């Protein structure tokens, strides 16, 4: 099985999973450990934002690759915003300070 792009799930908007769904592969919790033991910071930042979960970056990256420009512009993932909403719904005031 192999996947270049495909369908994303409804709430979190990350790739689906499985071969019957044409899904991605889980980059789990203990693979991030190996990658930050090597010190490979850019590989990790692209595994988290523009390959999985960043909505504007993952479509900007495609049009950079087609034009022969291997560069990314990462933003904030979507599941972090989901988390902030579900914590605010408990009566707790959590926010990002600048």
């Amino acid at each position: 099985h192999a996947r270049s792009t495909g369908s994303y799930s409804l709430v979190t908007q990350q790739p689906l999973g499985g071969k019957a769904q044409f899904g991605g592969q889980r980059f789990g919790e203990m693979e991030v450990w190996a990658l930050e033991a090597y010190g490979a910071a850019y590989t990790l930042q692209e595994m988290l934002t523009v390959k999985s979960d960043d909505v504007n970056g993952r479509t900007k990256m495609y049009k950079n690759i087609v034009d022969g420009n291997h560069q990314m512009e990462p933003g904030m993932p979507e599941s972090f915003n989901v988390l902030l909403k579900e914590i605010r719904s408990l009566g707790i005031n959590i926010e990002l300070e600048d």
Partner: protein, 465 residues
């Protein structure tokens, strides 16, 4: 208390009351009835500022003779027009007035339970009584800011005298400097007191008789309320015994109980003991009505109207007996022939009776895979389509540069490219002061050139859609 269950906490606080006997409910209903008429008595001799029935009998103008409906209203007012002629004699509290207006009460006692008609006459003074109250609040929010003074001499003689401001002479009498420490503001006291004195003008009566008999009118409206309360509180086991046959139908037990209690509170308000029946026989109707109305309005995620609920229930009842009789489940043809409805409607009804599945439904051998994991977002655009859109925009921008600038501005205005809106011929010729027809001429020029094969095969590449 060693328990946290609210159903037990309810059934415990509910058991400290005793069930009534046939005489108890009758002599409770009797006082419910006579308090609400003591009130209607107390409303009688209030001044014309009330909405009194002078022409309510004419406002509206068991099938009673019209001559009977026109005449017996003439007894009460035939005595009333001559009775309250004595409103002047010896102040406002004359004894002939009390005697013959409680004789009007002797007349009034004939009547019994009625719609809000009676309500809208006592409201006649609500909109007028609390008014008086709030106005003497105004004076106070105009006195405490400037001077401090002991309230229980001032407001006591305020309650007592109400003749004129002469009672303020009872403030200097103790010879303490808080007497006239007030400066230049007492005319605001006189402002608000004088406006309530012209209210007294329109009422014609002093406050300490109106509020005096409102003290006893409030006795009836509370003595009916208390008896209604202890008529309700003695019958909660009836609600609990009825509401136990509606379980497992979309609501929980305490929800059904609290829906039945709102119906019991209406059965208590509509009862009539004279007809001779017990209370259970009349109350069960309202209790069941409240519970049934709340099951059909709540207890479904997507709400169905009541007529569709009854159609669904009837079709279920028919298919039950046809299944018992045939030994099989009937096809919609065999249901349409007996229900006597067009078969397309029987097909339409059968889709509306399904409740949504939970997104936490375990799908597999394990319980870590759920139904909501395999649900895909359908409103996203594929990146091949984004790239195609941008490439087509660039190709069009390049082909639109070959021909004239003024002759491309008209195409940009005509199809809305790079602009906030599309335009029409006359509003484009507005800025060109060109005729209705010349725009179409130059458009048939541009669209004729743009498909010449020297130009077209760059744009033709896209139309394979």
């Amino acid at each position: 208390g060693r328990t946290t269950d609210p159903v037990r906490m309810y059934m415990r606080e509910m058991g400290t009351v005793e069930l009534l006997t046939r005489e108890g409910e009758i002599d409770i209903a009797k006082r419910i009835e006579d308090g609400i008429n003591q009130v209607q008595c107390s409303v009688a001799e209030y001044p014309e500022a009330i909405t009194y029935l002078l022409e309510q009998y004419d406002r509206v103008e068991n099938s009673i003779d019209p001559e009977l409906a026109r005449e017996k209203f003439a007894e009460l007012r035939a005595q009333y027009v001559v009775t309250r002629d004595t409103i002047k004699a010896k102040g406002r509290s004359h004894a002939t007035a009390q005697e013959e207006i409680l004789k009007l009460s002797e007349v009034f006692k004939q009547f019994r339970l009625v719609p809000k008609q009676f309500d809208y006459l006592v409201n006649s003074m609500r909109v007028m009584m609390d008014r008086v109250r709030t106005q003497e609040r105004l004076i106070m929010k105009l006195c405490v800011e400037q001077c401090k003074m002991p309230k229980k001499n001032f407001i006591t003689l305020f309650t007592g005298n109400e003749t004129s401001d002469t009672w303020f002479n009872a403030a200097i009498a103790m010879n303490k400097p808080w007497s006239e420490k007030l400066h230049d503001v007492s005319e605001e006291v006189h402002r608000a007191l004088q406006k309530l004195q012209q209210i007294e003008e329109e009422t014609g009566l002093t406050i300490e008789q109106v509020k005096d008999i409102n003290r006893r009118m409030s006795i009836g409206e509370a003595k009916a309320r208390r008896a209604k309360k202890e008529m309700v509180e003695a019958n909660l086991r009836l609600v609990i015994s009825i509401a136990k046959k509606y379980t497992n139908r979309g609501l929980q037990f305490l929800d059904l109980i609290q829906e039945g209690n709102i119906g019991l509170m209406k059965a208590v308000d509509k009862f009539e003991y004279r007809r001779g029946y017990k209370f259970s026989t009349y109350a069960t109707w309202w209790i069941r009505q409240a519970i049934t109305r709340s099951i059909a309005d709540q207890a479904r995620t997507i709400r169905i109207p009541v007529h569709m609920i009854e159609t669904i229930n009837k079709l279920n009842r028919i298919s039950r007996q046809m299944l018992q009789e045939m030994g099989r489940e009937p096809t919609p043809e065999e249901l349409a022939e007996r229900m006597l409805m067009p078969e397309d409607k029987i097909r339409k009804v059968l889709k509306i009776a399904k409740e949504p599945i939970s997104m936490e439904t375990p799908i597999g051998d394990d319980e870590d895979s759920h139904l909501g994991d395999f649900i895909e977002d359908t409103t996203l655009e594929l990146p091949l389509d984004s790239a195609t859109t941008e490439s087509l925009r660039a190709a069009t921008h390049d082909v639109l540069a070959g021909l004239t600038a003024r002759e491309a501005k008209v195409l940009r205005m005509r199809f809305g490219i790079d602009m906030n809106t599309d335009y029409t011929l006359e509003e484009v010729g507005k800025q060109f002061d060109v005729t209705r027809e010349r725009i179409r001429q130059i458009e048939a020029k541009a669209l004729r050139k743009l498909r010449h094969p020297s130009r077209s095969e760059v744009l033709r590449s896209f139309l394979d859609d």
